[PDB]
């Protein structure tokens, strides 16, 4: 039990990750498609967890999977307006949308993004990107909205995947790993691939509450720095 194979977070499927992070005995899966939505407690506090199964369709989002995430976030915001401090935790292993439902998937991402901003008037959303799929596409923009972004060494986070970059921008020009993101200030914590460590970081960040000056509110500063 002290060995990596039994302590690893990335080795777990999405449903196992969700069960492992929520307080013992609180895990309750809704709508039991490729996304797990679960209710539970996080250190005794009401919580909802959406976890994308990257092993299925590469975690590509469609109409149903997209609505599951958006709807979970929407109900958490509703809870908070009713005085219930529900916290949302997003496990983002995804590469984009399903071509066959492309515009429904994209519309759902816009709804997910809207719900994150609404909810973060009350509670921070924590996003965990652990790999092995990592987080690409429209959902990386969602990650960029979240109060806190936690990554592992095996995580990648970015807008465009490797293949679409090379096909559009070329084999080379004249980056997305968890360590790099942390070093450039685009992720808030760099985590060992260890279940207990991931769980504790998640709880510490929720207990921290809403950040005073998150990255999204620093446009003038980013514009200055890019201007350099």
């Amino acid at each position: 039990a002290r060995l990596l194979a039994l302590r690893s977070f990335t080795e777990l499927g999405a449903r196992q990750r969700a069960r492992a992070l929520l307080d013992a005995g609180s895990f309750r899966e809704l709508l039991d498609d490729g996304v797990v939505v679960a209710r539970g407690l996080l250190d005794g506090q009401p919580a909802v967890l959406a976890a994308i199964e990257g092993a299925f369709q590469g975690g590509s989002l469609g109409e149903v999977s997209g609505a599951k995430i958006a709807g979970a976030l929407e109900l958490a915001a509703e809870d908070n307006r009713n005085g219930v401090p529900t916290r949302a935790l997003l496990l983002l292993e995804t590469g984009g949308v399903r071509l066959q439902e492309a515009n429904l998937g994209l519309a759902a991402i816009a709804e997910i993004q809207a719900a994150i901003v609404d909810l973060q008037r009350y509670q921070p959303v924590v996003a965990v990107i652990a790999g092995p799929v990592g987080c690409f596409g429209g959902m990386s923009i969602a990650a960029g909205l979240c109060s806190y972004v936690l990554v592992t060494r095996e995580a990648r986070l970015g807008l465009n995947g490797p293949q679409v970059i090379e096909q559009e921008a070329g084999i080379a020009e004249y980056l997305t790993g968890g360590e790099q993101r942390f070093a450039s200030g685009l992720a808030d914590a760099y985590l060992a691939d260890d279940l207990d460590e991931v769980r504790t970081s998640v709880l510490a960040y929720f207990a921290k509450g809403l950040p005073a000056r998150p990255r999204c509110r620093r446009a003038e500063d980013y514009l200055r720095r890019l201007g350099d």
Binding site: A67, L99, Q100, A110, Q113, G137, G144, Q180
Partner: protein
């Protein structure tokens, strides 16, 4: 340079960017039906400091630039009796693709734009997205898709999708227009998109590339009615698909 630029000039009255803005951004304050509005458009800038963003893409400067321009309006109207409308004129080919863009966090820049637009909407600014051309992928998420109401021109050049036709062809090893045409959420045309229930209205125009006087009148009228329809009402996304509805009903039952 683009349909977005053409329509910005027609609707706002000016062509040149503001002193403080990236040249790939057009921003102008004006009035519609006596109501304060701000027009925003992303447009091509061949002299973009970022080489991968020189053909109208939403890249680093465009994402953070939009965030800044929207937040500027939000802060200015904090005390005003009337929050100015944000009129997004949408004609964007894609997000920028590049290694410098990824290294410098283009996903975060576009998140900045989304966050500003959403906060403005939640605070009571009417947001209207006017689709006059391409509305693609992350560029559309950043510029337009947070609108209270979406209005599209009914024209073959107006396309909403998650990826380019070329990219889609590569992944399905292909011809793709033919395949995508039978699957509405997969289709690129605006009639298919409208069938999803995601547009408030569609509008035919005579000369889509440079609006006629009658076109300008029809579009201004429609924007006016969208504005009237939003004001005082709920501040949700316009889209607010039976499967989606079922999902939300089940979540509420089981919450």
């Amino acid at each position: 340079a683009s349909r977005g630029l053409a329509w910005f000039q027609a609707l706002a009255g000016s062509l040149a960017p503001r002193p403080g803005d990236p040249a790939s951004l057009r921003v102008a304050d004006a009035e519609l039906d006596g109501y304060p509005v701000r027009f925003l458009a992303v447009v091509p800038d061949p002299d973009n400091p970022f080489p991968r963003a020189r053909q109208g893409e939403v890249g680093l400067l465009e994402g953070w630039g939009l965030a800044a321009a929207v937040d500027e309006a939000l802060e200015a109207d904090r005390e005003a009796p009337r929050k100015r409308a944000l009129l997004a004129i949408v004609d964007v080919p894609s997000q920028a693709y590049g290694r410098r863009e990824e290294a410098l966090g283009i996903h975060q820049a576009l998140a900045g734009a989304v966050d500003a637009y959403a906060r403005a909407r939640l605070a009571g600014h009417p947001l209207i997205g006017l689709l006059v051309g391409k509305a693609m992928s992350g560029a559309f998420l950043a510029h337009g898709y947070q609108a209270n109401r979406l209005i599209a021109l009914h024209d073959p050049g107006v396309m909403v999708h998650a990826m380019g036709k070329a990219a889609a062809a590569r992944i399905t090893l292909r011809e793709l227009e033919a395949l995508a045409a039978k699957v509405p959420p997969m289709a690129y045309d605006i009639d298919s998109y409208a069938s999803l229930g995601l547009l408030w209205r569609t509008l035919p125009v005579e000369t889509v590339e440079v609006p006629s006087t009658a076109d300008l009148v029809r579009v201004r009228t429609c924007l006016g009615e969208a504005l009237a329809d939003i004001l005082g009402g709920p501040r949700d996304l316009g889209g607010r698909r039976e499967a989606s509805a079922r999902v939300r009903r089940l979540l509420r039952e089981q919450w």
